[PDB]
């Protein structure tokens, strides 16, 4: 954006890097610090933010943390677990704040992350969508209220390549509701309905899963009664959703250097 | 309505009879002929159409076909298979046209019906919803066109007491599409998606089934591609949908006395 | 239901009375106390709850408060402002708790109500839908969070007889959001979009209004960004929604005799 | 794809060119002929289809029609009216078949196009979405059937930059329906509903317009009655929809060299 908190975007020609750039650009109060990328990169040294279209930006993609360690405040990393660990150890060093959206660490990789937080302020999360995280919070408000009277159904659609049903956001949704009811998902979940199934059992949570086309991700929780239903739906149209989520966090980091946070923290979902 | 085709509504204090009354009333060109009902009825002799609210109508519920055989042209029957057969034999007799929406005949009961048609004009159908029947026709237009490129998914929701999944309209939908593609439903249907399921197989038809609350019936067929999807949804809010369907047919009957028709005939779905 | 709090339902053959009966019946912990109705009633003395179908219930519709003042604890009133005032003065008298859903009082009628509360515990509200009231609460959580980044749109559909656009629940929704943002609805509302309108102004709230058929009421608030949108939709299928809302309140009343409450109170929306 | 009809994609690094490439690639029976682009291009001579990701394709972007006039059969043009005319005159010359999706010609530019068709087979259309074109056809089937009984409402949502309300697809929808009813859109359209509006007038068509976020385009026509509604919705997720539409047409062209067609022709909407 150009503003009071400057940022460097790790995996610059990543599907993630491309979109974080636009967001960095876009969002008030952040400014594009640096735009690193792999050494073997073609996009190296040259650029700016022109995968985020956005023509000439004046910050040029790179390959050394040292080259630019001076050109940003918060390190946004959507990379591969390998890089993050390098990034990690560097940021701890120069006390650089990070925002890790990289996934797939083993226990050792997480621990490293928990550890750095000791010295470094870190937002580390598996879903940076702001809509998704709010929704999960809302679902749990709703359940406290209607949960016991209502039939609660969860319906998700994704593209034709998604490989496990239900999706994890969907389970996540099942679980917030379930937990709001002191109950247990595994106890009341029903993922299939085929043939004669008999009338719906009270208190169970049903899942319905649609797979088609190019659908990025659509999740609705229905709280149904006699005479009404309440529905809370999230639709993702692009990966941009994660992007603004991380950048927003990048901005939230400014001013902290305690340890370890997530989107509840950034979002304050917990006082909502 | 008061108009050029007069009607008698068999099971007068039926959930069906109540709503057909309002429709008879409502719909231009039909007029409420008679309003029969069971002998043991409380509503007998007394009434009018005042289950259809509608205050005073001047036609009084009854119990004899002879009592009123002169007071209507088309016999609308949503009753029990037993009554319909009595009704049947009477209407054949006086050449009364019928509209049977009664369900649950065995082979012998159907045959009787096929037989009467010889002398009597009959609309006999298992779903009198006009929306549903149009939809089925549209689905099949759509499939000719997009069917081969697209992922085709069927999603139905019903109340918490519905006992087999998918619903029959849903299978019906599966089958029109399937048949439009020269294909066979049983060959490409998928009714469940649980756990690891792998990427979606091309050409299969997936079903997703929601059961909650008081939902009368909601059915959507999704034809999804990369970059778009086309959806054709029907929602039933009340049993009125069947009602106007039969009354409409009652009117369509006027002027025929050939045999045996259904909603494709009434609706001309076949030249659509 | 038969249980620990007994109830009398004012306008017994009202569209409201019929449905409250079923709810009283239905809902755990309440029991049908009495079923009053107008003197000139046909349904008088005779009945039970058999407008709520529900065959024989053992409580017989009436016309005197004295006749039954002993047969119930909480007075549920969905009547006409005239009756409520009579009802009012009686309940104050015998310290009967009320639940007023009657609408259309002038200032004097409200004041009477405020006044009785002094001695009598009263739930008095203009919308007893539980879904609607929760939703309004959720909308305001959502706005605190996404309100500033997002385009917020409100879309309502009602039947073809609804006479002012937007509906009042919709304005209500506009206003909770607006107020969550410290903002003012009248300042940022846009109710029409026709012709050339130019790009959407930031921070405005747009309303889109659908009128067709028999739609009881459907209200969705969309919080849209780049890459996602979050939607919170309420659908009413019947007047039953209000019914369970009042009965639920009837139960909430048990144990109070302070003054004056509403659905936030009953629902505790305020600690949600 | 690699197959029996070879194609060249005019504006190669266009938002359109990028997506047509993937489609050309994707779709069975077409093969990427050539990938032209402007002279001043950076992408020149070099490439393949690697804006369509898709790594190495073996066909290299260019700048001369002569350079490659031998390397393709059908000319797909999503360019600027200026280029199309050059393209035009060349294709007429070598009897190259075209598919023009370029927009913004004046009368003279169209005429040129009408004229070339004399010698050249051309698909020329303002909306290449297959879903949209089918939908329009379906809407008109539906209206013949339900049009007179039903309340018909049109609801479209687009992103926050769309500048005229309703969208043109929406009017287009209004007009197919209107015309199916022998009626006239301008006579029965209602684009706004604000304040007291009174009950809905029969036979009118209402439009409701949502503007928010990044919504590519969502259009639903609702045919509502008492007791049901039928909805036909199209959702665009990307510009890919147009892309497959043109490529599909490119394939449909194979074997013609008569004049002038559109998507009804390609799609055979007219015998549907
Ligand atoms: N947390 C969330 O909200 C969320 C959302 C989306 C993606 N992700 C995660 O984001 C990460 C990025 O995914 P993507 O789809 O953007 O991937 P992808 O397009 O494959 O790009 C990888 C990026 O990282 C760079 N890279 C790979 N290894 C590197 C190394 O050792 N050092 C430096 N740069 C390296 C690449 O050159 C490129 O910039 C993944 O770990 C993915 O699972 C997380
Ligand atoms: N075809 C469709 O579109 C469709 C739709 C809805 C219901 N149905 C069928 O409609 C029929 C009516 O259902 P309903 O829910 O209206 O039932 P219900 O409310 O139980 O009412 C039965 C009605 O038939 C009368 N009745 C029963 N046996 C009779 C007899 O022997 N002679 C004369 N009257 C007799 C009753 O007194 C009452 O009027 C059923 O067979 C149902 O399966 C069909
Ligand atoms: N607060 C909400 O959530 C909400 C929702 C729906 C309806 N309402 C209100 O509920 C009330 C009832 O509407 P309804 O549609 O049920 O009306 P309606 O069907 O007209 O019935 C009126 C009922 O009150 C009885 N009645 C009329 N005047 C009376 C009197 O002086 N004393 C005793 N009984 C009397 C009638 O005989 C019948 O029981 C109305 O004031 C309406 O505006 C409120
Ligand atoms: N018919 C439809 O279904 C439909 C749909 C989308 C876009 N369009 C039309 O597609 C066309 C392309 O839009 P776009 O968004 O892809 O535009 P845009 O990204 O601006 O790209 C223009 C493309 O044409 C090339 N170009 C411009 N002038 C040229 C010339 O004189 N000779 C050769 N190449 C030339 C550019 O270098 C680039 O390849 C526009 O006319 C647009 O209105 C039509």
**Ligand 4: centre distance to CA D11 (Å):** 6
CATH code, residues B1-129+238-272: 3.40.50.720
Q: Which atom of ligand 2 is nearest to the CA of B239?
A: 6
The dihedral sign for the CA sequence D121, D127, D130, D133: negative
Alpha-carbon distance values, B77 to A10, B81, B101, B246, B248 (Å): 73, 10, 6, 9, 14
CA separation for the pair B210, B218 (Å, rounded)? 9
Q: Please tell me which of the candidates A230, A242, A267 has its beta carbon nearest to residue C134.
A: A230
Which tokens hold the place of D15? Answer: 């938002």
The dihedral sign for the CA sequence B38, B44, B49, B52: negative
Q: Which atom of ligand 4 is nearest to the CA of D126?
A: 1
The residue length of chain A stands at: 272
| 3-state SS, residue D202 | coil
Active site residue B96: no
Which chains share 3+ C-beta pairs under 8 angstroms with A?
A: B, C, D
Residues in chain D with CB shorter than 8 Å from the CB of B232 are: 138, 230-233
Whole-angstrom Cα Rg for chain C: 21
What one-character DSSP code corresponds to residue C150? S
The answer to whether the CB of B241 is under 6 A from ligand 2 is: no
Q: Got the DSSP string for C190-238?
A: E----EE--SPPTT-EEEEEEE-TT--EEEEEEEE-SSEEEEEEEEE-S
Q: Got the DSSP string for D30-75?
A: -EEEEB---TT-SSTTT-SS-SSS----S--B-S-HHHHTTS-SEE
Other beta carbons within 10 Å of B118:
11
CA separation for the pair D186, D205 (Å, rounded)? 10
Quote the Cα angle for C131-C135-C140, to 5°. Answer: 160
Would you tell me the crossing angle of helices C15-26 and C240-253 to the nearest 10 degrees? 60
Mutate to test the interface with A, among B146, B150, B151, B207 (most CBs of A within 10 A): B151
The answer to whether the CB of C131 is under 6 A from ligand 3 is: no
Alpha-carbon distance values, B241 to B13, B165, C158 (Å): 17, 22, 18
Count Cα neighbours of C123 within 13 Å in the Cβ-side half-sphere: 28
Residues in chain C with CB shorter than 8 Å from the CB of A230 are: 131, 134-135, 232-234
Nearest to C161 by CA among C107, C214, C108: C214
Going by alpha carbons, the residue nearest to atom 39 of ligand 4 is D11
Which tokens hold the place of B37? Answer: 């009902």
Q: Give span(s): CATH 3.40.50.720, chain C.
A: 1-129+238-272
Report whether B81 contacts B11 (CB < 8 A): no
Report whether B87 contacts B98 (CB < 8 A): yes
CA separation for the pair C209, D155 (Å, rounded)? 9
The answer to whether the CB of B37 is under 6 A from ligand 2 is: yes
Q: Got the DSSP string for B93-131?
A: HHT-EEEE------HHHHHHHHHHHTTS-EEE-S---HH
Mutate to test the interface with C, among A20, A230, A234, A247 (most CBs of C within 10 A): A230
Q: Give span(s): CATH 3.30.360.10, chain B.
A: 130-237
**E strand residue ranges, chain C:** 6-9, 31-34, 74-77, 97-100, 122-124, 151-158, 164-165, 189-190, 195-196, 205-211, 217-224, 228-236, 260-261
**Ligand 3: centre distance to CA D129 (Å):** 52
Is the bond preceding B166 in cis, omega lying within 30 degrees of 0?
A: yes
Nearest to B119 by CA among B258, B232, B224: B258
Nearest to B69 by CA among B85, B46, B87, B83: B87
Residue the block writes with tokens 């002191």: A182
C38 has binding-site annotation: yes
Q: List Cβ neighbours of A114 (8 Å cut-off, separation of 6 or more).
A: A259, A260
Say how many Å lie between the first and final Cα of chain B, rounded.
28
Phi, psi angles (nearest 5°) of residue A140: -90, -30
Q: Are β-strands A228-236 and A217-224 bridged in parallel, bridged antiparallel, or unpaired? A: antiparallel
The residues of C annotated as belonging to the active site are: 158, 162
The dihedral sign for the CA sequence A237, A243, A246, A247: negative
Which tokens hold the place of D36? Answer: 């032209």
Using the Cβ of A267 and the Cβ atoms of chain C, whether some distance falls under 8 Å is answered with yes
Ligand approaching nearest to the C-alpha of C80: 3
Q: Which residue on chain A is closest to D214 by alpha carbon?
A: A237
Report whether D147 contacts D180 (CB < 8 A): yes
Q: Would you state the CATH architecture of domain A130-237?
A: 2-Layer Sandwich (3.30)
Q: CB–CB of C213 and D151 under 8 A?
A: yes
Q: Which of the listed residues D101, D104, D242 should we mutate to test ligand 4's pocket, taking the one with most ligand atoms within 8 A of CB?
A: D101
A264 has binding-site annotation: no
| 3-state SS, residue B270 | helix
Alpha-carbon distance values, D76 to D25, D93, D131 (Å): 14, 16, 20
The answer to whether the CB of B83 is under 6 A from ligand 2 is: yes
| 3-state SS, residue A115 | helix
Going by alpha carbons, the residue nearest to atom 22 of ligand 2 is B14
> Ligand 1 — pocket residues by CB below 6 A?
A 10-17, 37-38, 78-80, 82-83, 101-104, 125-128, 242
Using the Cβ of C24 and the Cβ atoms of chain A, whether some distance falls under 8 Å is answered with no
**Ligand 3: centre distance to CA C255 (Å):** 26
- Resolution, angstroms, 1 dp: 2.2
What one-character DSSP code corresponds to residue B156? E
Q: Please tell me which of the candidates A157, A194, A212 has its beta carbon nearest to residue B191.
A: A194
What one-character DSSP code corresponds to residue A198? -
Among the listed residues B1, B69, B162, B256, the single catalytic one is B162
The residue length of chain C stands at: 272
Q: Which residue on chain B is closest to C217 by alpha carbon?
A: B237
Query: How far A203 CA sits from the closest chain D CA (Å)?
Result: 29
The annotation places the binding site of D at 11, 14-16, 37-38, 79-80, 101-103, 125-128, 159, 162, 168-169, 239, 242
Using the Cβ of C42 and the Cβ atoms of chain B, whether some distance falls under 8 Å is answered with no
CA separation for the pair C8, C25 (Å, rounded)? 11
Whole-angstrom Cα Rg for chain B: 21
Quote the Cα angle for B12-B17-B21, to 5°. Answer: 95
A152-184: string of b/e by CB count within 10 Å (b at 16+)? bbbbbbbbbebeebbbebbbbbbbbbbebbebe
CA separation for the pair A251, A73 (Å, rounded)? 10
Is the bond preceding D166 in cis, omega lying within 30 degrees of 0?
A: yes
Going by alpha carbons, the residue nearest to atom 25 of ligand 4 is D11
H-helix segments, D121-224: 130-146, 168-180, 185-188
Q: Are β-strands A151-158 and A189-190 bridged in parallel, bridged antiparallel, or unpaired? A: unpaired
The answer to whether the CB of D211 is under 6 A from ligand 4 is: no
Count Cα neighbours of A190 within 13 Å in the Cβ-side half-sphere: 22
**Ligand 3: centre distance to CA A155 (Å):** 38
Is the bond preceding C166 in cis, omega lying within 30 degrees of 0?
A: yes
Nearest to D244 by CA among D5, D24, D10, D2: D24
Element (H or E) spanning A154, and its range?
A: strand A151-158
């Amino acid at each position: 954006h150009d503003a009071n908190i400057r940022v460097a975007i790790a995996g610059a020609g990543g599907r993630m890097g491309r979109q974080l750039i636009q967001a960095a650009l876009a969002l008030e109060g952040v400014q594009l610090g640096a735009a690193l990328e792999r050494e073997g990169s073609s996009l190296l040294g040259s650029d700016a933010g022109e995968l985020a279209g956005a023509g000439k930006t004046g910050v040029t993609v790179q390959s050394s943390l040292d080259a630019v360690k001076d050109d940003f405040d918060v390190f946004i990393d959507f990379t591969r677990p390998e890089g993050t660990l390098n990034h990690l150890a560097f940021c701890r060093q120069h006390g650089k704040g990070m925002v890790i959206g990289t996934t797939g660490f083993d226990e050792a990789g997480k621990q490293a992350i928990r550890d750095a937080a000791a010295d470094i302020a870190i937002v580390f999360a598996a879903n940076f969508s702001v809509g998704v995280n709010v929704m999960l919070k809302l679902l749990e408000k709703a359940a406290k209220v209607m949960g016991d009277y209502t039939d609660i159904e969860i319906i998700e659609a994704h593209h034709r390549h998604k490989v496990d049903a239900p999706s994890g956001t969907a389970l996540a949704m099942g679980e917030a509701i379930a937990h709001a009811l002191d109950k247990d998902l595994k106890d009341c979940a029903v993922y299939s309905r085929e043939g004669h199934t008999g009338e719906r059992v009270p208190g169970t949570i049903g899942f319905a899963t649609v797979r088609a086309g190019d659908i990025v991700g659509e999740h609705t929780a229905m709280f149904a009664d006699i005479g009404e239903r309440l529905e809370i739906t999230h639709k993702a149209s692009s990966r941009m959703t994660f992007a603004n989520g991380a950048v927003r966090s990048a901005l939230w980091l400014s001013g902290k250097e305690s340890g370890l946070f997530d989107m509840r923290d950034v979002l304050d979902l917990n006082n909502l």
